[PDB]
Each structure stands twice: as structure tokens, then as C-alpha cells.
Amino acid sequence: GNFKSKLKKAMLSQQITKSTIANKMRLKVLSAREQSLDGIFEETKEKLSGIANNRDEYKPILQSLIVEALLKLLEPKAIVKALERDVDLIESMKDDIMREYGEKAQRAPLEEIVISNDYLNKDLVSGGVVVSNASDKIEINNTLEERLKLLSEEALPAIRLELYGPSKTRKFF
Amino acid sequence: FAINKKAVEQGFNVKPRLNYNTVSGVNGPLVILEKVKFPRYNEIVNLTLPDGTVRQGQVLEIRGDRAIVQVFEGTSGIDVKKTTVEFTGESLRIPVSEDMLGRIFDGSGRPIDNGPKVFAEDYLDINGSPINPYARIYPEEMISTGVSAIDTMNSIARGQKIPIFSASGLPHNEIAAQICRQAGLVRPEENFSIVFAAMGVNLETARFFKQDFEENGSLERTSLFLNLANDPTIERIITPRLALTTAEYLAYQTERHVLTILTDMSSYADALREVSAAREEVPGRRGYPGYMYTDLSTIYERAGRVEGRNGSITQIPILTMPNDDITHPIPDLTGYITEGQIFVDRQLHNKGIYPPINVLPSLSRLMKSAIGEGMTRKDHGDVSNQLYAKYAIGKDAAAMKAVVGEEALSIEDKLSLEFLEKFEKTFITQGAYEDRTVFESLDQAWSLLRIYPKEMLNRISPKILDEFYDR
Amino acid sequence: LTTAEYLAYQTERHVLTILTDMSSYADALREVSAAREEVPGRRGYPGYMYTDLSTIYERAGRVEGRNGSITQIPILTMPNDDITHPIPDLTGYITEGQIFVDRQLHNKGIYPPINVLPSLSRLMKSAIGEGMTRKDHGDVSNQLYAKYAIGKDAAAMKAVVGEEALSIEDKLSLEFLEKFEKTFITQGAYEDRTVFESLDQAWSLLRIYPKEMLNRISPKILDEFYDR
Amino acid sequence: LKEFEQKNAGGVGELEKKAEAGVQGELAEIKKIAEKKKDDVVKILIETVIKPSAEVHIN
Amino acid sequence: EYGAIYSVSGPVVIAENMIGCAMYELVKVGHDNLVGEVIRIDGDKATIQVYEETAGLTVGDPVLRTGKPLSVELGPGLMETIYDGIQRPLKAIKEESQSIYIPRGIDTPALDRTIKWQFTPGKFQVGDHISGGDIYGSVFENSLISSHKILLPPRSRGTITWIAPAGEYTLDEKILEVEFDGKKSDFTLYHTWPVRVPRPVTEKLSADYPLLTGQRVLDALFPCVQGGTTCIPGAFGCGKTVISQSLSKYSNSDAIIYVGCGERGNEMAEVLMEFPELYTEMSGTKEPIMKRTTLVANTSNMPVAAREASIYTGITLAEYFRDQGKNVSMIADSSSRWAEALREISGRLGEMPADQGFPAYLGAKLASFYERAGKAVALGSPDRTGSVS
Amino acid sequence: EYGAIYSVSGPVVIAENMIGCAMYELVKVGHDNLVGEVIRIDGDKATIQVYEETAGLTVGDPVLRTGKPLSVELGPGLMETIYDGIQRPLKAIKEESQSIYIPRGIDTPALDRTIKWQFTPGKFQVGDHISGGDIYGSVFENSLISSHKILLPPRSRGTITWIAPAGEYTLDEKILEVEFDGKKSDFTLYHTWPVRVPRPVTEKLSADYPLLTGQRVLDALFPCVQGGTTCIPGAFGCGKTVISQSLSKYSNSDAIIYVGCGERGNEMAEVLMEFPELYTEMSGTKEPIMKRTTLVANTSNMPVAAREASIYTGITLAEYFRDQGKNVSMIADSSSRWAEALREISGRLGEMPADQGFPAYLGAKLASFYERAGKAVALGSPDRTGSVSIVAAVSPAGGDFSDPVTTATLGITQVFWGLDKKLAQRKHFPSINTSVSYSKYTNVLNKFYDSNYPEFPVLRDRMKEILSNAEELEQVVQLVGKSALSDSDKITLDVATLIKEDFLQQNGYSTYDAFCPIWKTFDMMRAFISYHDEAQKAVANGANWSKLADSTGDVKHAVSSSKFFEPSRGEKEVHGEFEKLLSTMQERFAESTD
């Protein structure tokens, strides 16, 4: 009986080691795939910044984004915030945005467009717009940074599907 | 492989969110916002204080351009003129994959095992949906637990829901951990697995759980959610349905045979009572809202068996008796939704017998479907009945001692006595790590049964007695 | 209370106060608690009268500066022979000691019809013993309480089982009890008993027993006065 | 008993390396195939980001 | 009119621009078109009770008025079917869904319209009058049932103008055209009826005919009349399923109905998949005992409403079948759980319990519900009869 | 801001023109400048707690906000001091007043600035990176607690740009120039911390090293371990304070804190001025034990909010000390009074309870308040290891199942000592019901006993089992009295009687009955075990119990007087006496048995 107790203790130690080791391999695998994901996402962020650095393609997309912000807001008295470098582009596109909001909306075109002296951090912010109504309590953030942030976590399932294709044992779905 | 179409369409569809700064006031644990757009009832909000700290909350109720939210972490010291909040534009949801095994999660379900993020295979709604009674079968094929005192007498079919009733001074959590360590299917793992949750445990209890479930090496079969006492109450109600959702996903999309255990429905009921005090609702009897029957039934019902799939789901919750009786509404109503009951004796603990369990008031309502052969030896059925009758006779004999005289007891009475002591000591007592296959426990029962003449056991088929009395 | 404070702690005179009825006080407080809506406590009582009761009982005791002292004796009426009722329960929470009376003894024509078992003075140790009294007092009281309870429970047991499990000491404690209520508790409306003769009668009643039952008596004291 | 005990006195590290190697091939292959299939995923993600989602919230 | 959701609160919702609506009427609220039901009408505002999960809803969503209180359909196809406490075709629902859940926001008619039926027109010709409860044709349905006897809904007056001749038909074709003041009125192979007010009958009659069970002790010493009331204690461990299983085979009533208030389901699962296995011997052995009964079952998952209206639906169907010229006998699952559901619904609505956590309603509700049983003569030209037990 | 008082309702006030505040924030109100904390806010009307008396107040009075929640002052001078529930110096207020009353609006500082101290720089050189929880110097506060550690309050980082020299110093002096971004990091000898939020810690740990009380039943039977808690009913005849005094004078505690909420005033004044009479019974006779004691005594007559905040203040102080890696203990007057205050406040606020007079959250609040106790390793480079133990003196309402607070406690705690009313009725104090109390730590604590008394557990277990059997057979015998009964029956009866009169009885005031060590308890237990076992094995073969006891004579009495063995008399003289007793008992059994 003493011998069997000692053997039991040794075998318990063996399985304890097995459990620890098995745990850590899987943790490492998860971390590694996470690193791959992180590389992908930082590459996407770099591409976002690079594209935002050029005015040509940026302008129409910026106008569309602001129009979408209007669609979300739905009032004729709002204030627009953006980096100082495109203030004149915004001023030029004011008329088009007003008219197109009037078109999309079932109400009349926008009455006013206002841009204060604030501008977003060129360092921290690289391309994007934020819209707040005239009363200036409700904010609409439509900046590329937070856009990609939300996408990254709200797109994980299909993203993984693409990364590893179909999965197994999920027979009924 | 068509759901992939929706998977891609949604996983490549992004929509921004609004942010508000229209706090009209805070009243107790609740906040009020006035100017809102198309509010969605009972969805989650992220609140940022004017100092950089951010919390989470859910919509309580809505009114024409008006909404009320509750902060999961309380409304301490927050501001009314410099605070903002964003809405997810969607109710709460949980990420899901087939790899939560080996990973632990907090009350909100976020990992706390210091490992990478869950890497959701998919998201899902927190609460499931009813199931067609037409689409269910009844269980069979008892599931082994490694505990002689339970399996031998009170077996459990793959699906039967049986609570366990405890008192304040009763050690039960240890029993749950021991069961998890000994949990498994009976040999003639394969797809069997476990998921565990706990509410309002002591810190030291939490560390105990973690370390034991790890060093046991069974963490692969399991996935633990936890909810400490210090955790905010609202999170309490979240955990059980999260665990249920995970178990449903596994069982009905991976054919896992799943078991789970809720630590104390008592704390859950307490937390529920906390809710609806916010609203001007006077609670029902004993100061308890009426609809707990419906709610607790909602939680319990998810367990069952589906013909179309090989998915076994079984539920074994635990409850504590407040005044050490059965009159509190919780046990009373649970006796209806449930099937059978398990009693743990405080006195037997005062007798030191581990586990301090007794069987006289405890029964399995559906063991009959899970005791036949192909799955356990034929004798297993009626041997238990004969043992129970002998146990009752021994209790009487114990009463018989001084009523008329210790010597006055009959030879039958004396035999019943000695059997009582021998069985209650050896057979019932289980070491903290002692493990018993059903077979060896039944053999112990046979040994303890041969104590009587072959004729005293007048509740058996002759052939079975002949074969098992002469080995 | 204002008058008592003024007199005591400005004239240094020892003053005692008697309050006839707290029940009427609670009644008036409840009375003016409903003409204006108020979330009621147990039995309609606003929960905060605990505060007012503390305010009333705040005034008592002695302080270093002032020689005069104040002592409170509020007479309280049980509504239905009850203690868990909010009034008596709350009073017991914050008050000191308590004096209890029972209808049974009065029906038995016993004056005063005190009920010892519930009535307890939280504070007795400091102002007893040697220096001012005889140290036996503590053991005397403890033994009296114990034997009284024993006799009461013995009578209760016999009331349901009869003379079939009655030890000799059971009936001894009984007869001790009957004599105790008959003589010790009973007093004339004009006789005062100093602690001395009181303890003398106590020892007289006690000496019916052997020197082994009375374990609540120190061997020293158990031997000093067992026989004089 | 001691002969049985000493079996793992040095084999624990050897078998730990055994498992470690057991996950290296597929391990690195994770990143290898990910990079192999990086262009498609990143380009699709950016395309999804850029495209407008104008919508009046049919209520 | 078809206004939007003014406000939401848990299982209680409030609408706006809701007019022309009685305080008892269903609604297909929200995009999910959940089966809500109105309770209190005040100003243009109203209070509507939802019966499914209310999470995720918003302000400004379509709401439509069914125009009538809770009802139930009646016609060919009832026999050999399984339904929810609110008459949900569980079989068809699962079949079309191919899913194990109960997809919230589901929609499936009470009875299939695809299947065609053979109809034999009655003996009433154009110009003849007609009254509620009259018989104007029959439809063969199963071997066990001779034919579904086509009846006229109560509160029906006028004369017939157009008649569908004999032939094959589905439950949608307008087979009858009558006129109380003009050809406006018409009818189909089926109809519906509210669930609250009992289905009226011509006249009653004292019940004195014995009940058939095939059990020595029961039918011999302590029997019940065909048209009587009976009660037995619960605690199934005593094996009360014997009376049910025998009665499913041994009854002088050609039609039997079992209503499931609601339980863990395993019981319902077993009874469900064991009922279509017993035998009866009319003109030779016949297995499908289900042909002699239609089953409604519930369980905790389905809302309280279903677990409240289950018994009403069952007894209404029993009254219908009695009036169809038959002897019916409906068995219950458990009154206690229905009484619970009632207590809890009242508590949710916030009503004061008479005692023991129960509202006063229990007494009158139970008495009225039991009043709906016995033998009687129902409307119809043949003046056939029936009984309810 | 400068608000206006709109409405006053006893201990409640509504101001107007309040904007941008925190619903937990101190406020100065009225002309007398009273103290109050906002509670519920909406628009510009603020519901404010008042911690003082209201009389003669009128609308429009100025209202001054503060901008911070309720905190307490931490540093030196705390120890051997008495404060109210809201951290006000009772002694300083009294002496300054030179009266016997408390003025309204007094602001005597929590920690005096009138005393200097001899500081010593630590080992942190200027220019080094620093963070909270890192000691940078120490000062002497008292002999028993010399070298008061000085720590950087958390949420405080930067680089030490300077160090103050050693020497004699008072508070109010910057002593550490640090820079996170700018010189702004200026710290004096003390600091503050909000009461509601517990301070952080590196991590937690298990429990071991059992606490000691000196009373046999508690330590022996239902073990108590530091870093833990329990509920102790107070009967006033079961030694209401004797247990506390024994804990203070025997428990190996670095610091002692007791609080008073339902203080009747008599007990308050007494305990206060009898602490001076108490002496430190540790490492030599130090006449003052208060050097380990700091008190927060509050009578009912103070505003309810004070009784509410008393426990938070006390536990915060406990955490502050234990952060230095010490052992602390807490004593509570009566938790029932605190719950009564809580329900009073809730009702006054105007929200319905749900527990026959208690708001639902009570359970959550009690759980949170409890969860600050335990054992943990401190935070910061110095690597301290603290330990907080407490005890809640539950005062029942005359019942057990009537008050849910009992359930709440029993649902969270892990050691609980019940109470048998009959024991009190028999004056059988120590009055504890054995069948109800329980202690889960016994399981883990085997790993500790095995080092000292590796046979103690099983012996105690068998003794408890015997007690349970005696309790059980009582219910049978009483209904039938003496009958045909085996010698074992009398054996169980008499052994249980001896155990209870020995164990469950002891004078609260005696050198051999008000205090016991572990080893002495071990000896008592072993002696009783041997007695009973030898008696039973002897009767196993004839040996009628009458003649058996006669042959052994007064062995039961021989062991009965063992209680009179005075402890502290060498631990070998007493141990030698117990060895002699065991020898005589075993030989006497062996011989008289034959």
C-alpha cells in the first residue's frame, strides 16, 4: 500500500506536468496567431495613413463620409471638425454636401455648415471627420482610425473564415 | 456551407456609432439622458467619466426621446456636465468558438486567464430561444460521476436535471470540484466535456477553484466563468445564461456531451431581487418578485436532448437553504421545474462522514430509464432498493436501542444495525480524492449485502440473488 | 430632560427622573407621521424613531466636571405582552438593563409580580463586590438564576411527562422554587430589605442543597457561608 | 520505487522539448500561410473600409 | 391608426395613434411582427402585453391591429396534429424552419391551405334561410372519423345565394355565399371563434349515460357520467397514466382531447412519441390512436400567455367537437401549473392577491370554466347532440 | 460654487443652482459652514447628506462645494488616539472647547501639526524613478511601533528630484521633490485617501498561522486564522467585552482597532478609561496597550450618517496600516445598528425596501465592505506582506431567522460562531451552540498543525463526534428517563458533562480560566481522550461501570482539577504535570480494569 501510494504521487506529478505543458503550448499558439493578426492590422493602418496623406482620392471619400454623418445627424444646424490641412477642401465641398443632403434627405438642403478653430491631432489623427450638431452635445465620429478599430473586432468571424477557410466538427452550421 | 454568405456580408459591413453628452441627472444606481435618437431597448452603453476612466452599462427603459441606463460598476462620483457615452447600436453579445476549452473568463465573460483574446469564431446573442417540445426526446444511459453514494443509489440519465440542496455550514463546493475531477462517461473523453460557473464566491474560494481545476489536469475538458462577491450585482445575472449559450453551442453544433453546475441559485435570486427594485415594483411574497418561476424556468429549460443530434446537455445546480428548511419560495418552486432532489445532512457532517450526504429524502425522478443493462449490470437496479430498505430498517433499529432495551432487538434488528454502521462508515464515506467506478461500488454493496442470510433479502429475482450471493 | 440637565449639571445635585409612558410617545410620533406621507417601517412606524429614542436617552450618567448625576427610569407598557414589538425591541437595543413584570404572578397574588428570567441588568459588575458589598453577591445571583431556571424547566417537563423521569434534584429544585417565590420575591409595601438580610435569606434557601450541585459557587465562598 | 521515480528526473525536459517541437511546423506555417494570404485579406479590408455606407435608417 | 411604438418597458409596451381598437385585440407589433395584445386604452395611448422577448426594440416602429380579440380556427385538419397553447403548428413550424429552436417572429397559419379536401354540399338551395350552427355539408377526413361535418358559425342569418357543388377544395376557396341584407356575407371551408365567451348551444340536457373505460374497479364502483366532472390527485409516481392510456383506447367518446398545461417536457416527449403507438380494434386492429385525438402541449419556455390560454383553447375545441355531433371527453395535465401562471401574470400586472398569493379571480374563473361541461343539444338542422366531460 | 438652499427636511436638504458636481463630494453649507455630501442630483437641485444638526437654517443660504469625495488623513500621530466616525479628534476638540459639548462647524485637523518627528531618509537616491507603494524613509512614532514607514500614495509616479534630510520635522513641509511632468510633485509627511474605494495591492495569498484567543472552545474547536473574519453574537452575559480584551492582550496583532456605533455611552466611557488600566501583556510589561490601539467610538446620538461611515473609516485605517506589512484586527460594536442606520437612511431618501425594512443592496454593500479583509503581499519595491483580520459583533433582534442580515453574513463569511440561549439561561457562559457554529479553515490548517500537534485534528474530531452523540441520545433519554441502558451510555453522559463543564465553562477573569495556550489545550484533549477510551475498552468485557468508577475512584475528578494548572508557569512544569497525570491515568486504568 505504501508503494502504491508513492507510485500514485509520482503519476500525479507526471500528469500535473503534462497539464501545465499542454496548457502552455496552446497559449503560445494563440499568442502567435494573435501576432500574425497584429501584423496584418498594423499594415492596414499604415495603408490608411498613406492613403489619407494624398488629397486626390481623399476628397471624394471625405465628402461621402461627411454626407453619411449628415444622414446620421438629420438636423440643419451642425458643426464640423477636421484637420486644418483640408479646411479649404471642406469649404469647397460645402455646397455639394448641402445639396446632396437635401437630395438624400426628404427635407430641404442643409442650411449652414460651420467649422470652428479646432483641428484634430495630425499626429494621432490621420484622416477623418467628426460631426456635432449645433447644440454641440451629440457627436458623430467618422474618422478612419476608429473606423478600422471597430471593423477589426466586428469582422473577426468572416476574417477567420478567410484566414483558415472552413472549419470542422461544426457540422450543423 | 451557406451561412458563410451571411458571415462574410456582416463581417464586411461596418457602421459607426453615436456619442452623447446629454446627461439630465443621476439618481441612485441609474442615470437619465434626455435627447436620444431611435434608442434600442436593453442594449449596452460605454460611459466615460471626466477623468479618463470608462465603465459599461445597459439601457433599462426608454421613453419618447428619453432613456434610462444602469451602470454595471455603479454611479460613483461621476459628473453631469462633462460626461459622454456611446451606444454599440446593438444588444449584448458573446464571442464564440470551439476553443474556450482550457480558458477562464470573468463575470462579463472577458478572459482573465492572461491568455490571448478568445478570437471569436462567431458572435451570438446572450440569451437563446425556446426549443420545440416536438423536437426533444427523453434521456437514458446514466452518466458516471465516480461517487458511489450518488451513482449507486441515485443515478442520473444523460439530461435529467437534479438540484442539490445545502445549508450555510455545509461544504458543497468541494463536492462540485471533486465531481468535476471525477466527472466522466461510463465505459461499456469521446465527446464529453464540462463548463463551470460560480457566483459570489470567496476570494480564497476562487483561488482554490482555479488551482485545483488546473493541477487536476482536467482543465482541457472544462471552461470556467467566475463571479466574485465584490463583483457588481448586475453582472451576476449575466453569467448563467452565458454559460448556457456556450453549452448549447457546443452540444448542438459539436455533439458534445456536456454538464454544468451553477454554484448557488440563492445568490442569483438575491441579485435578481436587487433588480426591479430600481423600478417601482413591490415584490411578491416574502419580498420576492413573482416572475422568478418563469425566469428560473427560462434558465433551467435549455437543458435537454435533441433527436436530430447527439448532443447531451445536463444541468446540476446547487441551492442553499436560508432558514434550514423547505419553505422558502426558491426551493419550493424549484421542486416543480426540477426532477428529483439531493439532500446533504448537517448532522452527518457533525458525524464527520465525508460527504455529509443522506439519501432518505433524496431520489432520482427518472433513474429508471438509466439503470437497465447495456449500460450497467442488471442487479444495479434492485440492489439499490434492497439497500435502501435495509438502511431504513437500520435507522429504526438505532431508534430501537433504549426504547425497550438494547438487548431486546431481534436477530434481524441486530443484523440491520451492524449493517447500518458498517455501510454508513465504509460505503458512504468517500475520500477527498477517492474515486470509485460504479462496478467496484456495487461489489462493495454485494459484500455488505451478504451480511444477511440469503433469505432476508426478499426483494430480488431468485436468479440474481443466486448469482451475486455466491461469488 | 432640559430641566434635569439644568439642575444636575449646574447645581451639582443628584437627581432621578421618572417617565410614565413611552407608549403614548410612540403613539404621538406615529400620529404625526401620516398626515404627511412617509414610507412606514415595521407596523406603520417611521423607521427613524430610533434616533429620537437615542435623543431622549442621551441625557443620563455622570461627568467629571459636575458632581450631580442623572438616572432615567422610563415605565414602558407592552401593547400585547411582547418584546419583539417595535417599541420594546428598539428600547432594548439602546437602553440599559430592563425590569420585567408578568401577569401570571399577579394573578397568583404575588407582589411584585416580577419575571426574573427576561429581566436583566446589563451593568452590574462594576458597582458590586468588595469595597461596598460582599463578593458572594455575584455567585449568589448566578446560582439563583441557574436553579430558578432549572426548577422552571423541571416543572414544565413534568407538566407533559409526569413523575417518570424526575431526578431527586428535579423535585428538590421545584420545592426550592415554590419557597423562593413564596418568601423571597414577596415583600410588604412598607418593608425595605438591605442587601445583607437579603443575602442571608438567599443562603438560607440555598443550604437545602449539597456542596456539589452548587457549582456556580467558588470553593472558597462555597465553604465560607455554607454553614454559620 | 526510486527507480520508477528517477525515470522522469531528466525525461521531463526531453518530453517538454518533444511537445515543443511537436508544435513548431504548423506553428510557423501559421505565419507563413498568413503572409501568403495577406494581400487578399488586407486589400479586401481596405476596400470595405473605403466604400460608403449611406443609409437613412429605414425605421 | 397603425401608429408606432411610443415607449417600451420590459414586457410592457405603449403605442400611439391607436384608435378603433378594443382593449382585447392582437397586434403584429414591430418589424418582427410579434404577437402582442392590448390591455388598457387611455386617450390615444394604450398598454400592450407582449408574449415574446421584448429586447432590442426601438421607438418608431410599425404596429398593426388585428381587429379582433384572441380567437382560434376550426375546420378540416384538426385531427392527428400537435399544437401550442396558442395554436402553433409545431410540426410545420419545425419542418419549414429545419431548426431546433422556436424562431422568434415566426408566422404559420393554424391549418394548412395546401391540402385539398372533398366536400359534399348539404341540402339547402338558393333562397332558403340558414342559421348559426346549421349543417350544409360534410368532408371525409380519416378512416376513424366518418367525415368532418361542415357547420355554420353562430350569429349567422340570411339566405344562401351561391353554393360550391361537390368536388375537391382547399380551406381558402369561398364555397358559400349568403345574405342577411345582401351578398356581402360569404364563408369558406373553415372559420374561427374567440376564446373567452363559450361557444353557445341550443339547449342542455341532464347527463345520465355511463362512461366507458374498460376498467373493473373504476367503471364498476365509482364511475362518472358522460357529461360529468372528475378530479384526481397528482404525484404521478402512483401511475395515473393508466387511466389516460386506457381511455385513449377505451372510451364511449369518439373524440378525446388532452391539454398540456406545461412541464419539463421529458414527460411530454415520452407521451408524444408513445401515443401514436397504441392499438384499438374497430373493424380490425387500428394503431393510430392519434386519429381519435388532437394534442396541445406546453412547457415553461413558451410564454405565460400560452401556458394560460391552453386550457381555454382545449375546452373551446371540445365544445366545437361536441356541437359537431359527437361525445367528447377532454383530459387535463395539471391545473396547479396553470394556477401558478395565473398568479404570476396577475403579479406582473400588479394585482392584489385574495390570499395565499392568489387573486380573487381563481374562484369565479374556475367555476365558469367548469360550467362549460356536460351534455346538451346544439344548433343544427339534424338536431343531433353531444356531451363534454 | 455658491448655491442657495431651496428645501430642508430634517437630515436632508435640497439646494438650487448646482451644476457640474459629483454625487459623492464634500460640501460646505449654511452660514455656520456645516459638512454635507451630495447624494442624488438632477438638473440643478441637489440632494445632500448632512452630517450634523439642522436648526434655524433658511433658504438662500450660501452653499460651498468642495470637488472631492470623503477621505481620511493618513500618516503619524494616528495611534493611541480617539476620533468620531468622521475622523475628528475627540480629545483635541474637548480640550480646545474647555466645555462638555461639541460646537457646530469645528474643524480640528485629523492629524495634529503641533508635534514634530525625527525623520530618516530611506535608500532612494535623488534622480531615481519612483512609484506608489515604495517606501522612501521612515519616522519614529512610538516604541512599540517605532520606524513608522513613509510611503508614496498610489496614483503617484515620477522621478525623485530631491530628498529632504534627516532630523526633527513636523507636517506641512514638502519633503520629496518628484517630477512626473513638472516639479508639481510636492508631498509632506501625511496624505489622504477616499474612504469608499479600497486601496490596491500586488496580489492576495492563502491563509495559515491560526489566530489565538486564549479561550478553549474557539481556538480548539472552530479554528480562527488571521486574514479572516467571523460573526460573534453579544449576549452581555457571555463575556461581551472579555473576548475583545483577550484578543487585544493575547492576539499577536501589530495594531488593534475597535469602533463604536451603538455605544450606549456607559460602555463607551468605561471601555475608554479602562483601556488606560489595561497593560500590554507582550514582550515585557508596557503599561499602555493603547500604543497598539486606536478607537472610533460613536454613540447613537450622533447623526446617522456618522454611524454609517464609521466602519468605512475604520477599515480604511486598517488597510493603511497593513500596507506596511503588519497584522491588524477589527472589532465592531454592533452590525445590527449599522444596518438599522442604513435602512433609516434609505427610507428617508424615499425608496421602498424589499426585506421588511432593508433595501435590497444591503447584501452587496456588506459583501463589498467585508471583502477588504484577508492576507496580501504589499505593493511596491519594499515588498511588504500585510494581513487584515476582523470580526463582526452581530447583535440579534431577539431572533435568529427573523433578521436577513444573519443570512447575508452567513452567506459570505467562512467562520461563524453561533449561540445557545439556554447556556445563557443556565449562566453557562461561555455560551456557544456547538451544533450550529462552523469553521471551514480546519481543512487547510492541517498543513500547519502537523508541524506542532500532528495528532490534534483526529482527536478533536472524535471528541466532537462524542459530543454530538450525547446531544442526540439526550432527546431519547429525556422522554423516557433512565431505563435499560449500557455502561457506555453513562460513559457518554459523564464524559460529555465533564467536557462541557470544563471546556464550555471558564471564568472570564482568572489566571487559569480566562486564557489558555495551544499546548495546554492539547494536553486537556489528550487526557480526556485517554480517559474515555480506556474506560470504554475496559467495559468492553464486563466491568460494570459502577464498580469501574469506584475502582478508578476519582480519576474524573483527578483530571477535573487540571484546569487549575496555571499556564505560563514554564510550559514544562505544566507539561510535566500533565505527563504525570497521563501516566497515572493509564496505569490506573490498566490495573483497576483487572
Swiss-Prot record, chain A:
Subcellular location: Vacuole membrane
GO cellular component: fungal-type vacuole membrane; Golgi membrane; membrane raft; proton-transporting V-type ATPase complex; vacuolar proton-transporting V-type ATPase complex; vacuolar proton-transporting V-type ATPase, V1 domain
Predominant subcellular localization, coarse grouping: membrane
Signal peptide: none
Keyword terms of this UniProt record: Acetylation, Coiled coil, Hydrogen ion transport, Ion transport, Membrane, Transport, Vacuole
Family: Belongs to the V-ATPase E subunit family.
Function: Subunit of the V1 complex of vacuolar(H+)-ATPase (V-ATPase), a multisubunit enzyme composed of a peripheral complex (V1) that hydrolyzes ATP and a membrane integral complex (V0) that translocates protons. V-ATPase is responsible for acidifying and maintaining the pH of intracellular compartments.
Protein known as: V-type proton ATPase subunit E
Natural source organism: Saccharomyces cerevisiae (strain ATCC 204508 / S288c)
Record gene name: VMA4
From Swiss-Prot, chain B:
Residue list for modification Phosphoserine: 129
InterPro entries in the record: ATP-synt_VA_C, ATPase_a/bsu_AS, ATPase_F1/V1/A1_a/bsu_N, ATPase_F1/V1/A1_a/bsu_nucl-bd, ATPase_V1-cplx_bsu, P-loop_NTPase, V-ATPase_su_B/beta
Glycyl lysine isopeptide (Lys-Gly) (interchain with G-Cter in ubiquitin), cross-linked positions: 6
Membrane topology term: Peripheral membrane protein
Keyword Transmembrane: no
Chain's role: Non-catalytic subunit of the V1 complex of vacuolar(H+)-ATPase (V-ATPase), a multisubunit enzyme composed of a peripheral complex (V1) that hydrolyzes ATP and a membrane integral complex (V0) that translocates protons. V-ATPase is responsible for acidifying and maintaining the pH of intracellular compartments.
Protein's recorded name: V-type proton ATPase subunit B
Organism: Saccharomyces cerevisiae (strain ATCC 204508 / S288c)
Gene name of this polypeptide: VMA2
